[PDB]
Write a protein that binds this ligand. Structure first.
Ligand SMILES: CCCOc1ccc(OC)c(F)c1C(=O)c1ccc(C(=O)N[C@@H]2CNC[C@H]2NC(=O)c2ccc3[nH]ncc3c2)cc1
Length: 335
């Protein structure tokens, strides 16, 4: 890419290769999940430098058969250099835990901001969707499906730019091949996943349409009391849903083109690929070059006092549970 950008990536690589776990102190929690959590950590030698550290329990990964998913998360996320994807700088490992040292984005999870605001305006949603589109353009060009798009997986940096996190379901898929794991939130799964027909990158465009709908109204378009009713609603299709009047004509047209039943008919999957999404009328006048250059003013400007401020995140219970058993199976050799 840019020669200066490349030299910076190489220097960064050399800098993190020198680091050890004992160089860091823990500041606070940014998130929690099934078998781990994300902590804000601070470098002892430079108080200005804070990071996000995902800490996962190895035995639980083994018990849930998530080994290849986590390996893929490291590979995909560590090799990605996109301004719209949180960086994974490196990993650590011991007998009990895996440790993923990531770029810190202190503006908050989009899900909590959506919750507190109820819904996002058209122009606000367009900015966040464009951030996803750019992340998708980068991933899809390298044959990588992401599969976990939803508001909890978009983080804002201190400027208000949005970035993808949580690549545990992201996967490299070959030309003309399909993958078969049933993963993801019931509200976001494409019909080809529900029907166990195999899915490919086209499932990501489906999920983009779901995201637009949820950001604009506060809720995904297909939702039922239980997962089974939700799946049937999804099978009925996006044309059977009565779009609220708050969704602008152009947004609704783009949502329905993203959420085509046939994966081959979905926008982003046609002749011009992702360009067909970016050139859609809903993005008319949107300055993509300024988005990529960081010139554009985000819709919501977060307040971040310092590199240790976690005020834009919910409170999270401390994990004071007895440590998990040692895992020496060795699937984590590369970590
Ligand atoms: C029994 C089923 C288990 O569920 C899984 C199923 C599969 C799997 O992998 C295949 C799993 F790991 C799991 C997990 O156990 C799991 C453990 C923790 C988390 C988690 O904390 N998520 C955060 C909260 N919400 C978004 C995330 N935020 C960041 O990640 C982040 C990253 C960098 C950042 N920089 N700045 C801010 C910032 C934020 C998620 C899932």
């Amino acid at each position: 890419e840019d020669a200066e950008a490349k030299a910076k990536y190489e220097a960064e690589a050399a800098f993190f290769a020198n680091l050890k776990l004992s160089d860091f102190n823990i500041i606070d929690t940014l998130g929690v999940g099934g078998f781990g959590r994300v902590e804000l950590v601070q470098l002892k030698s430079e108080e200005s430098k804070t990071f996000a550290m995902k800490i996962l329990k190895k035995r639980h990964i083994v018990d849930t058969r998530q080994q290849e998913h986590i390996r893929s998360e490291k590979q995909i996320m560590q090799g990605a250099h996109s301004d719209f994807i949180v960086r994974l700088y490196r990993t650590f490992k011991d007998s009990k835990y895996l440790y993923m040292l990531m770029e810190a984005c202190l503006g908050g999870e989009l899900w909590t901001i959506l919750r507190d605001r109820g819904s996002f305006e058209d122009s606000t949603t367009r900015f966040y969707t464009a951030c996803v589109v750019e992340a998708f353009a980068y991933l899809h060009s390298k044959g990588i499906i992401y599969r976990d798009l939803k508001p909890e997986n978009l983080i804002l940096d201190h400027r208000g730019y949005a970035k993808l996190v949580d690549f545990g379901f992201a996967k490299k898929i070959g030309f003309g091949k399909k993958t078969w794991t049933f993963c993801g939130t019931p509200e976001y799964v494409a019909p080809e996943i529900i029907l166990n027909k195999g899915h490919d990158i086209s499932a990501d465009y489906w999920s983009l349409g779901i995201l637009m709908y949820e950001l604009l109204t506060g809720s995904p378009p297909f939702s039922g009391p239980d997962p089974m009713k939700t799946y049937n609603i999804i099978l009925r299709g996006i044309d059977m849903i009565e779009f609220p009047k708050k969704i602008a004509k152009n947004a609704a047209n783009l949502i329905k083109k993203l959420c085509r039943d046939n994966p081959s008919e979905r926008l982003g999957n046609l002749k011009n690929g992702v360009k067909d999404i970016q050139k859609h009328k809903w993005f008319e006048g949107f300055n993509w070059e300024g988005l990529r250059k960081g010139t554009l003013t985000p819709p919501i400007i977060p307040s971040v006092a310092s590199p240790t401020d976690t005020s834009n995140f919910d409170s999270f219970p401390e994990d004071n549970d007895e440590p998990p058993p040692d895992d020496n199976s060795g699937w984590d050799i590369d970590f």
